[PDB]
Design a protein around this motif. Structure first.
Motif, PDB file in Angstrom:
ATOM      1  N   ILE A 119      -0.347  18.540   2.253  1.00 58.30           N
ATOM      2  CA  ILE A 119      -0.100  17.373   1.420  1.00 58.30           C
ATOM      3  C   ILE A 119       1.337  16.910   1.574  1.00 58.30           C
ATOM      4  CG2 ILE A 119      -0.104  16.579  -0.980  1.00 58.30           C
ATOM      5  CD1 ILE A 119      -2.394  18.368  -1.524  1.00 58.30           C
ATOM      6  N   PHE A 120       2.243  17.832   1.898  1.00 54.75           N
ATOM      7  CA  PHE A 120       3.671  17.548   1.895  1.00 54.75           C
ATOM      8  C   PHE A 120       4.299  17.661   3.277  1.00 54.75           C
ATOM      9  CE2 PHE A 120       2.438  19.553  -2.184  1.00 54.75           C
ATOM     10  CZ  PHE A 120       2.592  18.446  -3.003  1.00 54.75           C
ATOM     11  N   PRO A 134       2.414   8.194   3.318  1.00 51.10           N
ATOM     12  CA  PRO A 134       2.228   6.976   4.123  1.00 51.10           C
ATOM     13  C   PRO A 134       2.323   5.705   3.293  1.00 51.10           C
ATOM     14  CG  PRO A 134       0.132   8.099   3.803  1.00 51.10           C
ATOM     15  CD  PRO A 134       1.198   9.023   3.273  1.00 51.10           C
ATOM     16  N   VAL A 193      -0.162   3.897   0.493  1.00 45.72           N
ATOM     17  CA  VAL A 193       0.338   3.915  -0.877  1.00 45.72           C
ATOM     18  C   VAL A 193       1.383   2.809  -0.980  1.00 45.72           C
ATOM     19  CG1 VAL A 193       1.126   5.403  -2.727  1.00 45.72           C
ATOM     20  CG2 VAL A 193      -0.021   6.398  -0.758  1.00 45.72           C
ATOM     21  N   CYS A 244       5.894  14.093  -6.554  1.00 44.24           N
ATOM     22  CA  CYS A 244       4.443  14.175  -6.615  1.00 44.24           C
ATOM     23  C   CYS A 244       3.952  14.291  -8.057  1.00 44.24           C
ATOM     24  CB  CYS A 244       4.001  15.357  -5.757  1.00 44.24           C
ATOM     25  SG  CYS A 244       2.235  15.498  -5.506  1.00 44.24           S
ATOM     26  N   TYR A 286       4.428  10.617  -9.435  1.00 46.18           N
ATOM     27  CA  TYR A 286       3.593   9.520  -8.956  1.00 46.18           C
ATOM     28  C   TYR A 286       2.131   9.690  -9.346  1.00 46.18           C
ATOM     29  CZ  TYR A 286       1.357   6.006  -6.156  1.00 46.18           C
ATOM     30  OH  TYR A 286       0.593   4.935  -5.747  1.00 46.18           O
ATOM     31  N   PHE A 316      -3.493  15.964  -6.104  1.00 46.59           N
ATOM     32  CA  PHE A 316      -2.087  15.849  -5.724  1.00 46.59           C
ATOM     33  C   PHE A 316      -1.175  16.466  -6.781  1.00 46.59           C
ATOM     34  CE2 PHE A 316      -3.580  12.132  -3.102  1.00 46.59           C
ATOM     35  CZ  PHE A 316      -3.284  12.701  -1.882  1.00 46.59           C
TER      36      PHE A 316
HETATM   37  C1  LIG Z   1       2.211  13.576  -1.708  1.00 46.76           C
HETATM   38  C2  LIG Z   1       1.481  12.397  -2.369  1.00 46.76           C
HETATM   39  O1  LIG Z   1       1.853  11.999  -3.472  1.00 46.76           O
HETATM   40  N1  LIG Z   1       0.508  11.858  -1.605  1.00 46.76           N
HETATM   41  C3  LIG Z   1      -0.304  10.867  -2.005  1.00 46.76           C
HETATM   42  C4  LIG Z   1      -0.491  10.440  -3.316  1.00 46.76           C
HETATM   43  C5  LIG Z   1      -1.412   9.431  -3.589  1.00 46.76           C
HETATM   44  C6  LIG Z   1      -2.160   8.840  -2.575  1.00 46.76           C
HETATM   45  C7  LIG Z   1      -3.041   7.883  -2.914  1.00 46.76           C
HETATM   46  C8  LIG Z   1      -3.952   8.025  -3.868  1.00 46.76           C
HETATM   47  N2  LIG Z   1      -4.633   6.880  -3.916  1.00 46.76           N
HETATM   48  N3  LIG Z   1      -4.189   6.096  -3.078  1.00 46.76           N
HETATM   49  C9  LIG Z   1      -3.179   6.662  -2.412  1.00 46.76           C
HETATM   50  C10 LIG Z   1      -1.985   9.290  -1.259  1.00 46.76           C
HETATM   51  C11 LIG Z   1      -2.718   8.749  -0.204  1.00 46.76           C
HETATM   52  C12 LIG Z   1      -2.529   9.203   1.094  1.00 46.76           C
HETATM   53  C13 LIG Z   1      -1.605  10.210   1.336  1.00 46.76           C
HETATM   54  N4  LIG Z   1      -0.877  10.745   0.266  1.00 46.76           N
HETATM   55  C14 LIG Z   1      -1.066  10.304  -0.987  1.00 46.76           C
END
Ligand SMILES: CC(=O)Nc1ccc(-c2cn[nH]c2)c2cccnc12
Length: 112
Positions: free
Chosen positions: A25-26, A31, A35, A77, A80, A87
């Motif tokens: 994830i990290f 991207p 997002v 993380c 957001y 996440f």
């Molecule tokens: C590390 C992080 O916060 N990643 C992400 C959060 C939310 C989203 C996301 C959730 N819904 N739309 C985008 C991410 C989508 C693709 C890759 N990473 C995402």
């Protein structure tokens, strides 16, 4: 303290932290294409690839600046993402499992 053994220790520590992020994830920047509102909320994005670049650019010369960028990965993380998401829980898990990696690594650095 000498630079070379310290950077070797940070490289090993970064590898150990990446191992805890089993979903990758990290591993790379969030991207911004998928997002689009991310930078509206997060003033300093961070990820393990950027941390590796910073380490090799000699940007981390003490443990605190390494740990500060790790903490940014986690806090960004938590900020957001809603609490009921994978996440968010992944950041909680990384904070817990990564903290233990960091405490042992900092003790190694303090023996230098
Ligand atoms: C590390 C992080 O916060 N990643 C992400 C959060 C939310 C989203 C996301 C959730 N819904 N739309 C985008 C991410 C989508 C693709 C890759 N990473 C995402």
């Amino acid at each position: 303290m000498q630079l070379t053994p310290f950077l070797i220790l940070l490289r090993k520590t970064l590898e150990q932290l990446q191992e805890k992020d089993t979903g990758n994830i990290f591993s790379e920047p969030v991207p911004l294409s998928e997002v689009p509102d991310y930078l509206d909320h997060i003033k300093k994005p961070m990820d393990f690839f950027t941390m590796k670049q910073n380490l090799e650019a000699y940007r981390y010369l003490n443990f605190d600046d390494f740990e500060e960028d790790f903490n940014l990965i986690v806090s960004n993380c938590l900020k957001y993402n809603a609490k009921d998401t994978i996440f968010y829980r992944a950041a909680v898990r990384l904070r817990e499992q990564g903290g233990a990696v960091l405490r042992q690594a900092r003790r190694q650095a303090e023996k230098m």
